[PDB]
């Protein structure tokens, strides 16, 4: 690939620099490069991968929502055309991420944390595809997201404590999936509440730093619950 000639450590270093410069497209390219070196990623490296693509796709989703809103309120072909271009670009980014997961992140992920993180990611990028899909494709995409999230949940509940930030993050996102995507607000609320409640009871085992990581995500669960109830 385009980053194939750069040292693995240099790609990671440059991803960190790109993050500091808020150059998220660059950061994603560097992290794609790093994945494509063929070695398993560390916890820090998974964070960098996730931050990079989440920010790129975040920007695309924000742009798409703006354009769709203008398209809706406008009901020439320029708005629909431009919305479709952004849509295609977003689809391309999701396909790239799913590709990375397929080649070969998930298949080599043997530990709970790595496997859950990647399965969570699979769920997230199908969820983004679902936001812009229609018809039968949408139904299949939605079910694919649900399958990935559910497998992640199953592993997380068996192998990780309820304060694990990856477990918490997964539940947060899967809860949003239920509410916004699958139109299952009771499942969304139940998942968020139970996740919060189980984590609360395990907080006493955490160092100050881990306590901060876990309670941050718990706040986001509360924030969403506040919106939904």
């Amino acid at each position: 690939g385009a980053m194939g000639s750069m040292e693995r450590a240099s790609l990671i270093q440059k991803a960190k620099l790109a993050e500091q410069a808020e150059r998220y497209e660059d950061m994603a390219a560097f992290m794609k490069g790093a994945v494509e070196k063929g070695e398993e990623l560390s916890c820090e490296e998974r964070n960098l991968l996730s931050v990079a693509y989440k920010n790129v796709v975040g920007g695309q989703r924000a742009a798409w929502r703006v354009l769709s809103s203008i398209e809706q309120k406008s009901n020439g072909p320029e708005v629909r055309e431009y919305r479709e271009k952004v849509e295609t670009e977003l689809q391309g980014v999701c396909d790239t991420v799913l590709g990375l997961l397929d080649s070969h992140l998930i298949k080599e992920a043997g530990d709970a944390e790595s496997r859950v993180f990647y399965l969570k990611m699979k769920g997230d990028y199908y969820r983004y595809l679902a936001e812009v899909a229609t018809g039968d494709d949408k139904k299949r995409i939605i079910d694919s997201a649900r399958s990935a999230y559910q497998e992640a949940m199953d592993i997380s509940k068996k192998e990780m404590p309820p304060t694990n930030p990856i477990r918490l993050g997964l539940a947060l996102n899967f809860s949003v999936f239920h509410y916004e995507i699958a139109n299952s607000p009771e499942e969304a609320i139940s998942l968020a509440k139970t996740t919060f409640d189980e984590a609360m009871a395990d907080l006493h085992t955490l160092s100050e730093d881990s306590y901060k990581d876990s309670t941050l995500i718990m706040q986001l669960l509360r924030d969403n619950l506040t919106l939904w109830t």
Partner: peptide, 5 residues
Amino acid sequence: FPATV
């Protein structure tokens, strides 16, 4: 627009 991570 709800929180995700």
